[PDB]
Structures are given as structure tokens and as C-alpha cells.
Amino acid sequence: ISDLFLRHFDNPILGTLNDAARLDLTGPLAMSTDSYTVDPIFFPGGDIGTLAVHGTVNDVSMLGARPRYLSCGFILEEGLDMDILERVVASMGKAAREAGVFIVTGDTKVVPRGACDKMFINTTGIGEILVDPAPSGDRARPGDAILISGSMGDHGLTILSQRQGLNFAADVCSDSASLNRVVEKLVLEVGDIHVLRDPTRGGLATTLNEIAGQSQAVCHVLETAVPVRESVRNGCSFLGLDPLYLANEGKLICILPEERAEAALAVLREGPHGEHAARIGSVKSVGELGAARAGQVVMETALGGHRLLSMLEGEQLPRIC
Amino acid sequence: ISDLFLRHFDNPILGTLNDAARLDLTGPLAMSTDSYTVDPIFFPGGDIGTLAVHGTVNDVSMLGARPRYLSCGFILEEGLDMDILERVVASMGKAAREAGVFIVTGDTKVVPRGACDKMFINTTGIGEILVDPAPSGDRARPGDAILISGSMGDHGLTILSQRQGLNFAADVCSDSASLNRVVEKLVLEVGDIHVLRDPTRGGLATTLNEIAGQSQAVCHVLETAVPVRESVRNGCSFLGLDPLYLANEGKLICILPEERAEAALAVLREGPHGEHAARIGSVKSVGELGAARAGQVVMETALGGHRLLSMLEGEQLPRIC
Secondary structure: OOOOHHHHHOOOOOOOOOOOEEEEOOOEEEEEEEEEOOOOOEEOOEEHHHHHHHHHHHHHHOOOEEEEEEEEEEEEEOOOOHHHHHHHHHHHHHHHHHHOOEEEEEEEEEEOEOOEOOEEEEEEEEEEEOOOOOOOOOOOOOOEEEEEOOOOOHHHHHHHHHOOOOOOOOOOOOOOOOOHHHHHHHHHHHOOOOEEEOOOOOHHHHHHHHHHHHHOOEEEEEHHHOOOOHHHHHHHHHOOOOOOOOOOOOOOEEEEEHHHHHHHHHHHHOOOOHHHOEEEEEEEOOOOOOOOOOOOEEEEOOOOOEEEEOOOOOOOOOOOO | OOOOHHHHHOOOOOOOOOOOEEEEOOOEEEEEEEEEOOOOOEEOOEEHHHHHHHHHHHHHHOOOEEEEEEEEEEEEEOOOOHHHHHHHHHHHHHHHHHHOOEEEEEEEEEEOEOOEOOEEEEEEEEEEEOOOOOOOOOOOOOOEEEEEOOOOOHHHHHHHHHOOOOOOOOOOOOOOOOOHHHHHHHHHHHOOOOEEEOOOOOHHHHHHHHHHHHHOOEEEEEHHHOOOOHHHHHHHHHOOOOOOOOOOOOOOEEEEEHHHHHHHHHHHHOOOOHHHOEEEEEEEOOOOOOOOOOOOEEEEOOOOOEEEEOOOOOOOOOOOO
């Protein structure tokens, strides 16, 4: 019934329509999976289709890999508006085409009404790893710079504020974008990249916590150097949110030796949402500050003090992606 | 919060806990994805965990491939019974271990109550293709035997009959099982395998239709040679169902040249549910019968006549897998 798929995704790997798709790929590969439950489904600056491609493209690249192939799996609600599914799949085609990535295989389940809320999408990405060693949450080390690709809090703020009918500044919108090309350039052109990660789940603070944890170092962050859009700042205090824990869908943390840091910003500025790319701190070894412990993230505040950025709260906030 | 995952799946590829998992795989690969919405979640002979591993292992093998890695993505309902999630993940570990397959990466989304019905699972499998050329729905050709791995209708009948509190024969239960080892042996030991496929969506008739369609041949089936358990026969007429269109979760259609057919049954008999493995017909070229058209499936009935097995009806029957 629903075959807008070839009308938006078409390629000879998908259009062979077997139980599995055949892939030609070299050796060491990166694999990643995500499900997408964002509510609502259309919002300023993107949609579930948009997240579904972009976020999985990103997850694959975080291993310093070139994403080549996506697979994808819809769970749709009975009597769901077909125009909606049409728009979402069109979002996906464009995003895939835009990122150089082919959706090669899929599935589609339909469920009675009530059983699911309109639709959900899982996508699974596969790509080829470009370097040895490759970026990894446990490879942050004493003397590395911590860089951010762009502003924090945008995505989370915009769907939290849509879901309450509030509009705020017109310039508050999702940052859903593919960062494969930036990563590709980082790893092959700047080199010796230690950690790549995108602050999606629980925002910058908590992914900084996972890195600090995995590497057994501390992360040092400078509040002022963390770019946050003024309207996102204002949106966040109106609704009582910390933008450093809000989800981002189009951003990346990059952590590498000091020597290569300035060159990695160059690239990052030319990346999506890269106007605001910045060095936000450094990685220091246990007790180097000190007192601050291994697994801990400490921010020098704007006011000349300190703040421990602690892990979530806070099971989550629901359905932001 | 939910980390029974390492308590049931644990391996160093998953237990590195990055945005993506690193995989070491050779060249030509098979990839497949499925979402699992079966209702109810526990039934005689398997569960959603069970389908989730087994059915994706199967889908990958249908390309004559060795499945190596699964990724997996839960969508769970808020306040869902943790014992349930515990049982389902334990099902998955066992099934993965049992099939020689590692769950290497995952995701987990939680949604408010109402937004989804208890839980859903997508899994995506990846494996290495064992032969050139490889089995493919368009490779059925004049003079091939059509073989079945086992009895038809079992899975569909059992969850349709659970969902109505009915019990029927104790020997009616899901056939959820991994058929990677059978396939592996078929392709490397019997050889020149033309088509592999598992009659899941809409049962044997409709997957026979997809093959007949893709190959541009007719499929000839012999009703009596199609194994159906007596209690499944009786369960099916009580509830007004055609067992040849009921979903199967542990079965496979194998289509190959006549010369290798007897040797492929040997293997098939030693396969799961292989007691009943049988030759059910042959593949004939347009007009060879004739009148019967390309894309068509014609059965010689038990009573000495003919029946055209037509494509579904019949959007589906909901949530059988």
C-alpha cells in the first residue's frame, strides 16, 4: 500500500525487495541504531524524518566513520493521515540524498489505534571507519581541548516550546543536520581526533559526563565559551530549563590534542551551525585543579566561581527526539 | 536505569558504550531490519524477544549469509512491568547466544502511557554473504523444486488463538527459531541455491506470490505435500483462517535446481522444525501448464482440481509479529 518509498528513496539496492539488502563495504565498520519518538512530529527546522536520517548519520560518524547505508523501520498508527507519512518520507529522502547516504532496506508495521501515537521510526546506519585509532569516549586525555560544533539547547527548547503552543523568537528552531562531512574532514584532514560525540540525550552536560567517566579524566568547561543563543537563554529561564542539559540534534563535541585544536575549529566553523563553533575547555588529569574527581565535569562560571555539572536528574524529559 | 542488557547480552563491542559499535566484517554483506509488534507479548513457544532475534537472524540468512551482528531498539511504555522487560531481554540473550550472534549496539526510548502499547522492538541484523551468486527472489527458474522447511500456519494460528483466550491442541505453538545454520549448510554444502525466503508476512501463499512475481515464472504447489498440523487445520477452520496465508516465524522456502533437491531436503529435515520438511512443488515457465500467468501461484488441490493462490486480501491481520 505505502510505496512512496521508491518515490523518495529509490535505488537498485532497495528496489530489489528481498528479505535483506546486499551491501559492498570495506572491513572495519561503524554501526548505530536509533528510534525516534519526537512529539510533535513537525516543528520549526525539522521533523521525525529529519531526525531519523540526520541523527543516525551522526551516530555513525562519531566513530570517525563514513556513513553509507541506512535501514529503516516504521511503526505507524491505523488511519494515520497519509499526507503526514508522505511528508515524513519526503523529509527522509531529501535528508538521505543531502547526506550522501542510501536507505537500502526497511520494514513497516501498522498497529491498531491507541497501540501507538501516530508513528515511530527506527533507523540503523552503517559506515566505513576512516582512521586507526578511531574516536572513542575513552580516549580523552590530559591536555586535550574540548570543542563544540555550535550552540547548545536549541532542539530541546524548540520542541518543549512547541508542545506548549509557545513561539518565542523566530530564530529558535531545531538544529537537526548531518555532520558526516565535518567529521570526515576532521579525521582525514586534521587528524589525531580523540573523541567525537553528539550531545543528544540530556545535552552537553551529560555527554560530557559520559566522556569524563569513560576516559577517567576531568573535563574543564568555561561557561562563557559555551555558545547559547540569547532567545534560547530567555526561552530556557521562562520555562525553567538548563540549556546545557537540553537535547541537541545537530551538534558534536570534539576532543583532541592542543596542537590540532585551532585547525579543528577551522573545519568546525564551516560545519553546519558552525558559526558558533568554539573551544569550551580542556581535559585535565585527576587532582590537577584540584579536588575535582575522575568522571566529573567542572565549569568555571561566568561570575568567577564554579559549578559541578552533574549527571541528569531525571529519568529524562519525554519524546524530545 | 535498565541495564539488564550487559546482564544478558554482554560482549566487549556492546560494553564500550559509544554512539556506534565497531564491527570487523568481510566485503559483501547482507543487511536486514524488522520491527516487532506482536500482541500478546508472551505466548506458547516464544515471545517478542524470541521473534526479535530469530526473525532478524532469518532475514539476514535469506541472502545466503552468515549473520554476525544485531543492533536493537526498544520503544517501551512508561510504568511497564520491569519483570516483563527482564524476561524479554533474557529471551533475547539466549536466542542470540543460541544463534551465534552478538547484539552489539542499541537504543531505548520510553514514552508516556497511551503513546505505545507496553513495548515494541526493532532489530537490525548484519552478516557476511557466503556465496556468489546469492539466493534472491528473482532467481527462481523453470525446473527448480520448491521446498518447505516445515509446517505452515503454526505461528499465526497460535497468537490469533491466544488473543481470544482459546487453547486448542497443546501442540499448537509458535515456531520462532533461527535458521542460519540450515541456510549456512545449504549454501556451502548443497550449493546452487536459487531462492531462500521465509513465509512470514501473509504466509506461504503471498511469499510464493512475491517470488513468482520477481522471477517472472509460475510456482506449482501440491496441496497434500504442504505440511499442516492436524490441530492447526482444526484451529484454522474453527476461526475461519487459511493456514497458507497465516504468518510463520520459523520456516523457510528453498527453491533450487531439480538435481540438488533431494540433498537440500536432507539438510532441511535436520533443520529446526525439519521433521516435516517437504518438496511442495516446482517452478514452471509461462504457459507450460498452461493458461496460468507469470506472477501466479497455482495449487493442485487435494480433490484433483486447482486453486489460484492470490495475493493477500486484506491489508493484514494486526500485530501477529
